[PDB]
Design a protein around this ligand. Structure first.
Ligand SMILES: CC(C)c1onc(-c2c(Cl)cccc2Cl)c1COc1ccc(-c2ccc3[nH]c(C(=O)O)cc3c2)cc1
Lengths: 11, 228
């Protein structure tokens, strides 16, 4: 996946 | 300048204006030593921090959050470099203080980047600058650049397109109305969007070289640019 980007958005 | 639009821009320039980049970080462009090694470590730091700032800024764009979750990622990956090139170019042309343009230029010119790539990248900076783009224009393009539907591995092009279309129109208006001196201004601005695309190959090759000469980026950069 693209775990870091997704976290960035939700964060 | 309709009320639908005349406030929408103020939301956008509100976002674009938020001083996300930490002074403490950018300052390193000036204060640290100058060498091939250090230059490259410095630039990675700015770029990785910038990627964070773009993702922040991108969120605050209108109707972005209502987007498809899987879709949203493809725009970021595709538009990340172009967006980065815009601000970096904005610095040199506008001589932003947090930019440290002269010293930033020195770093870039000795980062282990080839001449083939260095020459054009710096041509782009010059030409775009001679355009005398306003802060309004810069922030607006960046928005346009982010939402470009042509970007690879996407399905719902129409949904983004609706998000994008308003923005193109606001610029179309702003450049001509603010610049009736010439009507080719929209033509020039969007022309550059093509010019930006030229760097995605340039940049993929720059990464390749750096990689092969034992440089390593951040977990974030590797993710967005698809670095093994
Ligand atoms: C070194 C690697 C990560 C790299 O690969 N390509 C590029 C690369 C290169 Cl040279 C050129 C163009 C694009 C890329 Cl994507 C880079 C370095 O890219 C950046 C260079 C400078 C900045 C930067 C520096 C200072 C800043 N201040 C502010 C502010 O808002 O105050 C924003 C900002 C951004 C961001 C990325």
């Amino acid at each position: 996946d693209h775990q870091l980007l997704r976290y960035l958005l939700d964060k | 300048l309709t009320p639908d639009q005349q406030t929408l821009l103020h939301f956008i320039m509100d976002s674009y204006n938020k001083q996300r980049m930490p002074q403490e970080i950018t300052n390193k462009i000036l204060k640290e030593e100058f060498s091939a090694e250090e230059n490259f470590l410095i630039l990675t730091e700015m770029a990785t921090n910038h990627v964070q700032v773009l993702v922040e800024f991108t969120k605050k764009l209108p109707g972005f959050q209502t987007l498809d979750h899987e879709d949203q990622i493809a725009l970021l990956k595709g538009s990340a470099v172009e967006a980065m090139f815009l601000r970096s170019a904005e610095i040199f042309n506008k001589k932003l203080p947090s930019g440290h343009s002269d010293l930033l230029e020195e770093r870039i010119r000795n980062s282990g980047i080839s001449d083939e790539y260095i020459t054009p990248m710096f041509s782009f900076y010059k030409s775009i600058g001679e355009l005398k783009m306003t802060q309004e224009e810069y922030a607006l393009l960046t928005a346009i650049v982010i939402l470009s539907p042509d970007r690879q591995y996407i399905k719902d092009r129409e949904a983004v397109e609706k998000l994008q279309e308003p923005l193109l129109d606001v610029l179309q208006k702003l450049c001509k109305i603010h610049q009736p001196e010439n009507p080719q201004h929209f033509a020039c601005l969007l022309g550059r969007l093509t010019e930006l695309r030229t760097f995605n190959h340039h940049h993929a090759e720059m990464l390749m070289s750096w990689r092969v000469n034992d440089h390593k980026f951040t977990p974030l950069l590797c993710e967005i640019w698809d670095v093994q």
